[PDB]
C-alpha cells in the first residue's frame, strides 16, 4: 500500500496546486468579484480593499490572519466565530499533543521489529505486506513492550491537553454569547414564545381567545397578541411557494388562486389547533415566559424561546407531544438500521482497499488480473472516493429525518443532524475500517493456525495498515477540498455559465451569485470524522495528527477567507452549537480510550488498567461541565432582557414580522 | 436448608401472633392512648372515635380498609398519599403477575428432574443438598428445556404489568399533586426564591443592597424583602440549640450568651457571603423568578424553589457551586468504597448461611463439630439477622453523606439517602446473596471437574438455592417488622417507663408522646430491598412472589392505621417522590430483566436473545416518561400562583417565617 500512498498523497498535491494558482489569477480579475469576493457586495463595502493595485499575490492570506476575532463576528456573526473557535481548539488540542507525542513515539516505534519478527513466520505468498507501517505503534512494537509504557503515557497527554482546552473554550464561548446578546436591538424575537401544545377550545371558545384568556390571566400586562393561524396550511404554504414561482416566472394565476383560497379556508374552517406565538409587551416578560413550565403535567402548553422569524419551521410547529414522541423513536429505529446499511458499504471500501490481501483469500483468481499498474490507481483514488461519495448522501437524509421529529427551528434541526451525523461516522467509519482490514489481513492467517499466542500480534498488525489508510483518506480530504473551496471553481463555473447564457433580467445575476451559509450542517459533521479518526488513530499511529494538524490548519486559514468574503449567514444562534461540539470532542476521547484501552493490552500489556482511571475522568467531566455552563447557552437572561431599549420596541411590527408569508 | 426455613418462617410467626395479640390488647386501655392513637389527640379529634365500646376487635382494621385516600391526604398530607401508592402499585405488580406467573411455573417446576439427574453425578459427602428447591426454575429444569418456554414468556408477563401499573401511577400521583397545590393556603414557601451562589459585592456595596438593586431592576414591582444573613452563623446554629437546651433544663446563662453573640457577629463582620431568600410580592411572581435562569454562565444567582421554613437546611445554603462540585464528586466515591466493603460482609452472611457446604472448604475440621441441633438454629436466626443489622447502619450515614453535598431542602437529601441506599441495596444484596451461594456451592465441585457442559448446570442450581434464602429473609422481616410496628411496643416501653420514672413536667410528658414522621428514608429504601429481591427472583424461583404480595399488602394494613393513628407528618413536598420511586423501579425490571437473560442462558435456551428486545423497551420506557411527567413535579405551576388570594396575603408574617431562629 505504500505505493499507493504516495500516489495518492502526491496526486492530491498536484490538484491543490493547480487549483490554488487558479484561485490567485481568477480572483483578481474584477468581473469575478460576485464569486469570489461577495458579503462586501451585498453589505456595500467595496469588492475587495481600495482597488489600488492588484493586491499582492498572497493578499487573501494577510486579510484572513489579521482578521480580529470581533471582526468575524461584527460582518458575519456569533455563528461563525464560535465555528472558528472550534477549528482553533481542534488545531490546538492536536498541535502540542503532536509536539510531544510525535518525536518521542516515532523515535521509538522504529527503533524495533515486531514486524520483523512477524515477517519471520509469514509463512509463504503473504511477502510483501508492509513497509512505512512500521514507523506507528504498529506491527513494530513487541508484545510485552517496555516501550509500551510511552504509549500509555501519551494516552494521557492527549486527554489532559484535551480537557484544557475544552474547558478554556467553553468560558470562552459563553463570554462570546452574552457578550453579543447584550449588544444587540430590538429583534422579532425577543418578545415573543411559542406554544405549541394548547389544549383544546372549551364549549364554544374561539381558539384565539382561549388562548387570549389564558395568558391574559398568568400576566394580566403582558400579553399583546397572538399569532395562531396554523399558517394557513402546509398546503397553502406550497401554494405560495408556487405563487413565488410564477412570480419569477413573470421576472394558472386565478385558478392557483381559488385553489389556495379554498383549501385554507376549508383546513381552518375546524380548528387552527396549536401553536402560536404569544408576543409579549416588554422583553423581561418574555424572557420570564420562556424559561418557565407553565402546566404540570407535561403535555400541555409547552412555551420555549421562540426561534427568530427566519427559522420558525412552521410546517412542524403543531405535532402534539404524542406524534413527537412516536416520531423520536421511529427516527432513531431508522437511523440504527441506516448505521447497520453503511456497515455494509464500508466493508465494501476497505476490501476495495487491500488488493494484494484480497485475492489472496475471498476472490482468489477471480480477480488476480490486478497487475501493477491498475493495482495503484485502483487502491489509491478509487477506495477513498467511495467513501466520500457514501458519507455525502448523509447530511441530507439526517436533516430530513431530524426536521421531521417535529423539532422547530432550524438551528436545533441541523444540530441534530449534526448529531446522527456524528454517530453514524463513528461507529461505521471507524469500526468498519479498522476491524475489516484487520479481519480480512488477519482472516486468512487466522484460518491456518489457532492458539493464541500469534492471533493478538496479527489483528494489531491489521489496525495499523488501517491507519495508513485513513491517512491517505484524511490527506485527499483536505487538499482537494479545501483546493476546491477557495477556489470556488465549481460555483464560478456556474454562475459565468449563467450569466452568459441563461440570465434574462439583473435580478436573475442577483439571484444567481447569493453566496449562502457556511453549512453548519456539512462542515461540522464532516470534520467531526476528521477528529475522530485522528483522536483514535493518534497513538496507534502516530502519523495521522501531522496530516491531522494540517486539515484543521488550513481550516482556520481557508475558512476565513470564506466568511469575511463569501459566505453571508443566514441565522442567528448567538453561539447555540458549542453544547453539541464539546460533547462530541469528549466523546472522541472517550472512544479513543477504550480503544487505547483494547489496543494496549492485545498488545499484553498488563498494566493497561492504567487507561481505566481515564476512562472515568472522562466521564465526570463530561457531567461537571454540562452543570456548569450548559445552562447558559439554553435561555436568554432576564439580566439581557432588562438592558435600556432606547427607541421604544415598537410592537405591530414584530408581530408583523412572524406573519407567515 | 429446608429444615432452617421451616424454623426461621415458624418462629416468626409465632412473635407476629404474640406481638399482634398484644396490641389488640394494650391499645383499648385508654391510658396507652399517647402511643396507640396519636395524631388524633395532637390534632384534637378524641383519641378514638366516640369511645362507647371498646372497638370490637378487629376495628384498626375497618378503619384503615375504608378510610378514603382523600381522608388520608387531608389529616396526613400529600405524601402519605403518594407512599400509600407505592405500596399499592407494586403490590398489584405483584399480585397480577403472580396469579398468572404462579400457577403456571409451579406446577412447571416439579415435573422436571434436572436436580435428580445432577444428583446423579453428586459424587460423594455431597448428598443431602436441595429439597423444596425442587419447584422453582432451578436446577430443576433441564438445560435445553422445552419448557423453559414459559420461563421467557413470564419475563414477559412480569414486565408488561410493570409498565402498566407505573404508567397508571405517574397519572395518578400527579393528579393528586396538583389537585393539593390548587387546594392550599397562604404558606410561607409560596412566596420566596432562595439565590445560593451569589457574587460578591461591588466597591464598598453592603451585601443585602447588592442584592436589593440586582432583582429590584429584573422586577421592579416585585422584590419586597431580602433575609441573607447566614443565620448568626452555624456556631450559633449551636449556640441556640444549647440555649435551647438550658431552657429545657429550667423546664452559663451570660457567658454562653456572650460567646454567641461574639462569635456571630466576628462571622458577619466580612460578608454575610451567599444564600438569601427574596421574599417577592405576589405569588405569580415568584414562581416565575423560580423557574428562571437568572444568569448565563451558571455559577452566579442560582435561583431555586425555595423549600418551605421547616425544611431549608439553613447549615448548607451557603457553599458556592465549585466547592459543591467537589463535594459532589467525594461523596460518590466514598459510596462506592463502602459498596465494596458491604460485599465483604454479605459475603460472610451468605457463607454463614450454608453450612453443611461451608465445611467441606473454607474451614473442613475447623468447624465439623456442628451438630444438627446448633446447625439448624445458626442457619435461621443468624444470617438473617446480620443482614438487618448490616443494612441498618447504612440509612443514617447515607442521609449524611448526602446532606454533606449540599442540596437545600431536607426533602431532596432524604430522596438522595434513598438513591445512594437503592444502588447499595441493589448491588451488594443481590450480587453478594447469589453470588457467593453459588461459588460456595459450586466451587468445590468445580474444582474438581472441569468441561463446560455441567459447571453452568451447577451454577445455576446455586442461584435458585440463595433464592430460598433471600425468601426466609423477607418473610422474617415481614413478620416481625410489621408487628413490631402495629404494637409499638418498644415506643409503649420507652413512654410508659418516662412517664413513670423520668417525667418531671408535664410538657415532658408531651414531648415523650410526640410520635414521628414516617421515616421516609428508612421506609421506602428498606422496601426497595424488597421490591429488587422479589423482582429479580421472581422467575428464577417462582415463591418470592407468594411472600412478597405478603409483605406489600400487609403494608397498606398496617401501615395505614399507623399513619391516619400515628405518625404526624413534618414536612410536605406535594408528592415530590414518585419520580424517584418510578425511576428505582423501573430499575429493578431492568436489573431482573438482565438477569433473566443471563440464566435462561445458562441453563442453555439458545433463543434467551428474546429478552434483549425487552431490555431496550424498559430504557425506551424510561425516557419517554421522564419527558412526560417529571416537569409537573419539578416546579409550582403559574396556574397555581394565581389562584385566587381571598385574605391579601400578609407579608412581613412571610418574612418572619424564615427568620433563623
Redesign the interface.
Known amino acids: 500500500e505504500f505505493g499507493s500512498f504516495l500516489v495518492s498523497l502526491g496526486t492530491s498535491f498536484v490538484i491543490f496546486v493547480i487549483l490554488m494558482l487558479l484561485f490567485t489569477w481568477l480572483s483578481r480579475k474584477s468581473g469575478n468579484a460576485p464569486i469570489y469576493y461577495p458579503n462586501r457586495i451585498l453589505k456595500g463595502l467595496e469588492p475587495w480593499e481600495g482597488t489600488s493595485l492588484t493586491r499582492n499575490p498572497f493578499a487573501w492570506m494577510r486579510e484572513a490572519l489579521t482578521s480580529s476575532e470581533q471582526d468575524v463576528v461584527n460582518l458575519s456573526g456569533v455563528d461563525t466565530a464560535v465555528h472558528f473557535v472550534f477549528l482553533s481548539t481542534v488545531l490546538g488540542i492536536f498541535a502540542c499533543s503532536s509536539l510531544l507525542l510525535l518525536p518521542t513515539l516515532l523515535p521509538l516505534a522504529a527503533t524495533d521489529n515486531n514486524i520483523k519478527n512477524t515477517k519471520n513466520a509469514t509463512d509463504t505468498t503473504s511477502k510483501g505486506t508492509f513497509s512505512q507501517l512500521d514507523n506507528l505503534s504498529m506491527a513494530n512494537i513487541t508484545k510485552k513492550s517496555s516501550r509500551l509504557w510511552a504509549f500509555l503515557g501519551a494516552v494521557y497527554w492527549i486527554s489532559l491537553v484535551t480537557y484544557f482546552f475544552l474547558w478554556k473554550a467553553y468560558?470562552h464561548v459563553?463570554?462570546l454569547?452574552?457578550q453579543a446578546?447584550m449588544s444587540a436591538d430590538v429583534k422579532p424575537e425577543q418578545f415573543a414564545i411559542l406554544v405549541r401544545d394548547m389544549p383544546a377550545p372549551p364549549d364554544g371558545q374561539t381558539q384565539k381567545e382561549f388562548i387570549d384568556s389564558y395568558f391574559r390571566?398568568?400576566?394580566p400586562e403582558t400579553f399583546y397578541r397572538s399569532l395562531v393561524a396554523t399558517e394557513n396550511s402546509k398546503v397553502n404554504k406550497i401554494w405560495e411557494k408556487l405563487e413565488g414561482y410564477k412570480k419569477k416566472l413573470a421576472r394558472l394565476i386565478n385558478e392557483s388562486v381559488a385553489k389556495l383560497e379554498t383549501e385554507q379556508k376549508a383546513v381552518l374552517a375546524e380548528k387552527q389547533q396549536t401553536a402560536a406565538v404569544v408576543f409579549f409587551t416588554t422583553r423581561?416578560a418574555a424572557?420570564?415566559?420562556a424559561?418557565?413550565?407553565?402546566?404540570?403535567?407535561?403535555?400541555k402548553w409547552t412555551v420555549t424561546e421562540a426561534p427568530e422569524p427566519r427559522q420558525l419551521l412552521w410546517q412542524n410547529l403543531n405535532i402534539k407531544?404524542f406524534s413527537r414522541?412516536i416520531r423520536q423513536?421511529f427516527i432513531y429505529f431508522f437511523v440504527a438500521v441506516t448505521i447497520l446499511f453503511y456497515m455494509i458499504p464500508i466493508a465494501f471500501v476497505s476490501a476495495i482497499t487491500t488488493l494484494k490481501n484480497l485475492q489472496r483469500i475471498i476472490p482468489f483468481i477471480k480477480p488476480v488480473v490486478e497487475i501493477t499498474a491498475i493495482r495503484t490507481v485502483l487502491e489509491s483514488f478509487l477506495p477513498q472516493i467511495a467513501l466520500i461519495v457514501f458519507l455525502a448522501m448523509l447530511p441530507k437524509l439526517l436533516l430530513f429525518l431530524s426536521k421531521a421529529e417535529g423539532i422547530p427551528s432550524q438551528s436545533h434541526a441541523i444540530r441534530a443532524a449534526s448529531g446522527k451525523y456524528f454517530y453514524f461516522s463513528v461507529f461505521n467509519v471507524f469500526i468498519g475500517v479498522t476491524l475489516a482490514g484487520t479481519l480480512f489481513n488477519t482472516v486468512k492467517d487466522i484460518a491456518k493456525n489457532p492458539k493464541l499466542d500469534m492471533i493478538i500480534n496479527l489483528l494489531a498488525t491489521s489496525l495499523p495498515k488501517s491507519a495508513t489508510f485513513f491517512l491517505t483518506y484524511v490527506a485527499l480530504k483536505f487538499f482537494i477540498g479545501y483546493g476546491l473551496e477557495l477556489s470556488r471553481i465549481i460555483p464560478l463555473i456556474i454562475f459565468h455559465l449563467k450569466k452568459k447564457y441563461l440570465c434574462k433580467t439583473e435580478a436573475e445575476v442577483k439571484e444567481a451569485w447569493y453566496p449562502g451559509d457556511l453549512s453548519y450542517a456539512t462542515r461540522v459533521p464532516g470534520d467531526m470524522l476528521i477528529l475522530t479518526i485522528t483522536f483514535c488513530y493518534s497513538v496507534i499511529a502516530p502519523l495521522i495528527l501531522i496530516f491531522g494538524i494540517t486539515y484543521f490548519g488550513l481550516g482556520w486559514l481557508v475558512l476565513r477567507n470564506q466568511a469575511l468574503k463569501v459566505y453571508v449567514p443566514s441565522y442567528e444562534s448567538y453561539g447555540r452549537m458549542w453544547p453539541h461540539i464539546h460533547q462530541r470532542i469528549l466523546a472522541a476521547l472517550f472512544l479513543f480510550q477504550v480503544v487505547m484501552f483494547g489496543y494496549l493490552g492485545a498488545k499484553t500489556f498488563f498494566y493497561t488498567a492504567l487507561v481505566i482511571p481515564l476512562i472515568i475522568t472522562s466521564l465526570?467531566f463530561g457531567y461537571?461541565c454540562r452543570?456548569?455552563?450548559?445552562?447558559?447557552?439554553?435561555?436568554t437572561?432576564?439580566?439581557?432582557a432588562?438592558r435600556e431599549l432606547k427607541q421604544s420596541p415598537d410592537l405591530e411590527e414584530i408581530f408583523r414580522a412572524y406573519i407567515p408569508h
Open positions: 468560558k459563553s463570554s454569547r452574552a446578546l390571566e398568568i400576566y423581561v424572557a420570564s415566559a424559561q418557565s413550565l407553565h402546566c404540570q403535567m407535561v403535555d407531544l414522541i423513536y465526570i461537571v452543570q456548569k455552563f450548559y445552562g447558559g447557552f439554553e435561555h437572561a432576564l439580566e439581557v432588562c
